[PDB]
Design a protein around this nucleic acid. Structure first.
Lengths: 133, 100, 149, 64, 213, 135
RNA sequence: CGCUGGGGAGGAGGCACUCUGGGGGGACCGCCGGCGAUAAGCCGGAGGAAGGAGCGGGCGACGGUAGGUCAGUAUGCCCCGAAACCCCCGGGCUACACGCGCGCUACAAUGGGCGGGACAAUGGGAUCCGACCCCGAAAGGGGAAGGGAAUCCCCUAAACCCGCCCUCAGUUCGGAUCGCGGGCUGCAACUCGCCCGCGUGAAGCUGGAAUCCCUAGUACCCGCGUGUCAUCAUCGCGCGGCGAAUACGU
């Protein structure tokens, strides 16, 4: 059987697919073990290392992620992978573990950008020019 | 063998009207229709300065015109065209039909 | 086994090392007297930069093909130091890309779809995948997690 | 010098010319004057349960 | 160049950066024990989630706090080591990757030179760089410079800021690097050497405070 | 086996530096023209100077005397389409200074805008002189 | 392709996922703790996508400031008819011993260069956007599919990662000023435009007295679109990328 999941992180969207296999994970056609940089690789692989060998050596996961930066892509893929694993196992020990570790694995992140306002719109909403009187 | 209808309007009342009309037509009659399909809304923004002079702090008016878009495919029967072309087409709606 | 199982760095390096046996791929007359783009300040420091550029163009036509010259220009361009003015992005030059693709064609590694771009041929595909197989067998010595792939 | 610990048990109020200080009552955990409750000021965010290291135990700050 | 077994590193156990443990680390200051987060993690990155809540900083791993301190430009609107440090385009501001790597190299050097756990080293350094100060209080009309005690959370903020500033100092317009500077600062503060900006300022602050008691 | 300071045309360049960067101490030669000349001569610019054979120096000079004949495209040169002869040429320091002088002086001799700006010492091209350019 | 186990491209056929856009739901100090007149209410805990007018915006009362705008149009009085009215040519608003405001680039290793590897969103587009092919070292030139825009185009962004050179120097930092040449727009480029190549290589080694902006996807850092527009962006209005430190006060 096959299962599909999704994940969102600011402006980025990931779709993951899990099925039976040997333990391979691919993100945009390439393995996760040669993902650079390390700060994104650990981000993506933290749920797998929490789930363990006896669960991950039996499945194969493929993620297609597009939009919004490499860090956002990595977070979205992490979310999708956690959700897919929890569903595929229908295990609750895993869910408790993930929740005590970081509840944004399964739950998402709702933060987006604030629109910009005049008096130096380019910089941001709250930043302004300086005066000297 | 299918006819394609594009509807554009600044008001959704006329759009709901026309689309429910076409649905009733094609349902009371034997003829197939795919939709209606909502296309992305097209908005025109014009931002200008309020002051007629150059003094005072600068403040800006943001004006926005919105345009909604719908699509339908109707299968182009003969009774279909005869009963479709004669419908109340208000002035706040633009319609374009073509063949495929 | 495939281009997607190894990194682009080592693969471009090894492909450039291997392209030095194809006689149809030789640097042109003006290669040692030019920069790679207006966005550049100084001209290339390596003496065998032609082969690296050709190998990269080859891998790119593989990955993102069919593709033409302007999109490759956009890939190979970059940021510029404009002096006291702020920095802007500018696209690279086209003659280098053209000559690279024409040479790969004459060698029979790519072909042009009549109307949209250029793609690789089966022998080009085999070239790249064999080189990647070698490199992956080498890497498995260090990263035992790649064996399953 | 190794100070003397004491445990915060009651916030009194905010003092200072700018609102950066806080009057507090503390209990001496152990040392010479163990068990005594005194009144002392503390710079920074605090809450009941916190521990502070006192160099003295003998200054008995003034009531706000 | 970095070897490949370090460029492509794969962790298997829950460990800070996959390399250093926490169970062998022991705090001793009962005031700072409950604010030094030693949770077992792999990536110290919280993405700014714990800022809004008042005491939300006690849930952040020390390493993430240090990384965020190191993520700085130097000293604007005040002088440190005698001089303004304004970089403004060659600064690592909003670049957590570089700070991550700096801290990693520093930890490697510390382990190499000490044969202990760099987290234990950093813990003792904090313990020895946290000051136990003076302010201005008005007892009615009249104002006096008084001596007041400090809270653990502000102590920690002070110590981390001072360590990072010491590193930024010793790496200023010199041949030394930021990682080596941070390692020097940490070892010095942990073994109580006056060569350390942080221990120095701790002693100076307590010295002044003792006056105005 | 490395001369620590070599003596090239007119100039006693530093041997402690690479050749491409040591040749840069000559007026009329930048890093790019230097790299060109070295790639033509057949010398590795990426190597510590000092082992600059007499014949290597002589060939560098042969090239600097007439670069176009030895390749060196006419668009990488310092003075294309010379006002008096055509004959794209590259000058190093001496008729370089003198050629700058002669250009400015011919501009002055006909009473042109640019010549008068050179005389008075003010910006020549188009700049706005009200807020900046303070002596 | 290597080790037949894997990986790609089509075109059938589908609306599962993403997205689009109409209609509905959901949060109310509602539950529990404390503090408060037992009232109106305050702080905290869970649960939860979201927690304390959820977040960010539009609409800014009665009044007043002899605040600004007759040089946007409308208008009372006063003034100018071969004129202060209506058109063409040439100059000027771009002039520079200086004092100021707002900024851009830097004074280097928390870096410069070379070659490789990645990853967006907003908007706009008929004599307009222009893929694709061919010329050209570059700027640019010659043809030209398609597109009235969820169909085609502008569009493989930079900061970031990898390897090599440089190792604390007015330097491989910095990049002003000037010479020769090659192009575009336009009826016309000297006064007075923009781009490209080779040369040239000025101040500047962290900045007194004083002073500005910023409480979270905020501030700092990075680039892009659009307005103006025949040509010209260190500006205005917006867009996403990476992403903190402190206080919950007076």
């Amino acid at each position: 059987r096959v299962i599909q999941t999704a994940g969102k992180r600011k402006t980025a969207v990931a779709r993951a697919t899990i099925r039976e296999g040997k333990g391979r994970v691919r993100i945009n056609h390439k393995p996760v073990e040669i993902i650079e940089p390390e700060i994104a690789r650990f981000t993506i692989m933290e749920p797998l290392i929490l789930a363990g060998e006896e669960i991950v050596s039996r499945v194969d996961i493929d993620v297609k992620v597009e939009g919004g930066g490499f860090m956002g892509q990595a977070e979205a893929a992490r979310v999708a992978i956690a959700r897919a694993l929890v569903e595929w196992t229908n295990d609750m020990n895993l869910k408790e573990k993930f929740m005590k570790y970081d509840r944004t694995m399964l739950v998402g992140d709702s933060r987006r950008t604030e629109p910009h306002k005049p008096n130096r719109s380019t910089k941001g909403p709250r930043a302004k020019r300086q005066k000297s009187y | 063998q299918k006819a394609r209808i594009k509807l554009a309007s600044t008001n959704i009342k006329a759009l709901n009207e026309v689309t429910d009309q076409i649905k009733q037509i094609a349902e009371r009659t034997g003829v197939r229709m795919s939709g209606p399909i909502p296309l992305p809304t097209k908005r025109i923004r014009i931002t200008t300065r309020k002051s007629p002079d150059g003094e005072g702090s600068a403040t800006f008016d943001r004006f926005e015109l919105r345009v909604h878009k719908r699509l339908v495919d109707i299968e182009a029967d003969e009774r279909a065209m005869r009963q479709i072309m004669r419908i109340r087409v208000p002035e706040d709606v633009t319609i374009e039909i073509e063949l495929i | 086994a495939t281009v997607y199982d190894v990194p682009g760095d080592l693969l471009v390096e090894r492909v450039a090392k291997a392209l030095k046996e194809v006689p149809e791929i030789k640097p042109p007359e003006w290669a040692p007297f030019v920069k790679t783009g207006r966005h550049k300040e100084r001209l290339p420091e390596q003496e065998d930069w032609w082969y690296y550029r050709v190998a990269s163009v080859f891998r790119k036509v593989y990955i993102d093909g069919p593709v033409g010259i302007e999109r490759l220009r956009t890939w190979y361009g970059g940021r510029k130091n404009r002096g006291h003015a702020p920095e802007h992005f500018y696209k690279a030059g086209g003659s280098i890309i053209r000559k690279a693709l024409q040479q790969l064609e004459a060698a029979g590694f790519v072909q042009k779809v009549p109307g949209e771009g250029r793609i690789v041929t089966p022998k080009g595909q085999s070239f790249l995948d064999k080189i990647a197989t070698e490199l992956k067998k080498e890497l498995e010595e260090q990263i035992p997690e790649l064996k399953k792939y | 010098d190794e100070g003397y610990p004491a445990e915060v048990i009651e916030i009194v109020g905010r003092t200072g010319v700018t609102g950066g200080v806080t009057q507090v009552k503390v209990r001496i955990l152990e040392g010479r004057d163990k068990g005594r409750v005194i009144r002392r000021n503390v710079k920074g965010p605090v809450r009941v349960g916190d521990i502070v290291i006192l160099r003295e135990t003998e200054r008995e700050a003034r009531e706000i | 160049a970095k070897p490949l077994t370090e460029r492509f590193f794969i962790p298997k156990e829950v460990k800070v950066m996959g390399r250093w443990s926490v169970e062998d680390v022991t705090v001793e200051d009962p005031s700072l024990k409950p604010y030094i987060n030693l949770d077992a993690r792999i990536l110290p990155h919280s993405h700014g989630r714990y800022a809004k809540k008042p005491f939300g900083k006690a849930n952040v791993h020390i390493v993430e706090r240090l990384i965020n301190k190191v993520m700085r430009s130097g000293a604007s609107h005040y002088k440190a080591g005698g001089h303004f440090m304004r970089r403004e385009h060659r600064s690592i501001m909003s670049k957590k990757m570089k700070a991550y790597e700096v801290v990693k190299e520093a930890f490697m050097i510390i382990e190499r030179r000490t044969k202990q756990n760099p987290i234990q080293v950093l813990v003792k350094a904090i313990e020895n760089s946290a000051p136990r100060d003076t302010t201005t209080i008005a007892f009615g009309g009249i104002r006096y410079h008084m001596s007041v005690d400090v809270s653990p959370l502000r102590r920690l903020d002070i110590a981390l800021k001072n360590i990072a500033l010491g590193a930024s100092i010793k790496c200023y317009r010199n041949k030394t690097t930021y990682a080596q500077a941070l390692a020097e600062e940490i070892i010095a503060a942990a073994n109580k050497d006056p060569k350390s900006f942080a221990y120095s300022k701790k002693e100076e602050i307590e010295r002044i405070a003792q006056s105005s008691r | 086996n490395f001369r620590h300071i070599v003596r090239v045309a007119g100039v006693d360049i530093d041997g402690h530096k690479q050749v491409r960067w040591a040749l840069t101490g000559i007026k009329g030669i930048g890093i790019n023209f230097a790299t060109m000349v070295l790639r033509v001569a057949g010398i590795d610019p990426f190597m510590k100077a000092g082992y600059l054979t007499d014949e290597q120096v002589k060939k560098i000079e042969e090239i600097l005397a007439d670069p176009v004949a030895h390749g060196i495209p006419a668009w990488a040169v310092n003075r294309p389409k010379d006002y008096e002869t055509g004959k794209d040429m590259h000058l190093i320091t001496a008729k370089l200074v003198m050629a700058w002088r002669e250009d400015v002086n011919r501009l002055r001799r006909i009473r042109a805008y640019r010549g008068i700006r050179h005389e008075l010492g003010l910006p020549v091209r188009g700049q706005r002189t009200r807020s900046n350019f303070r002596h």
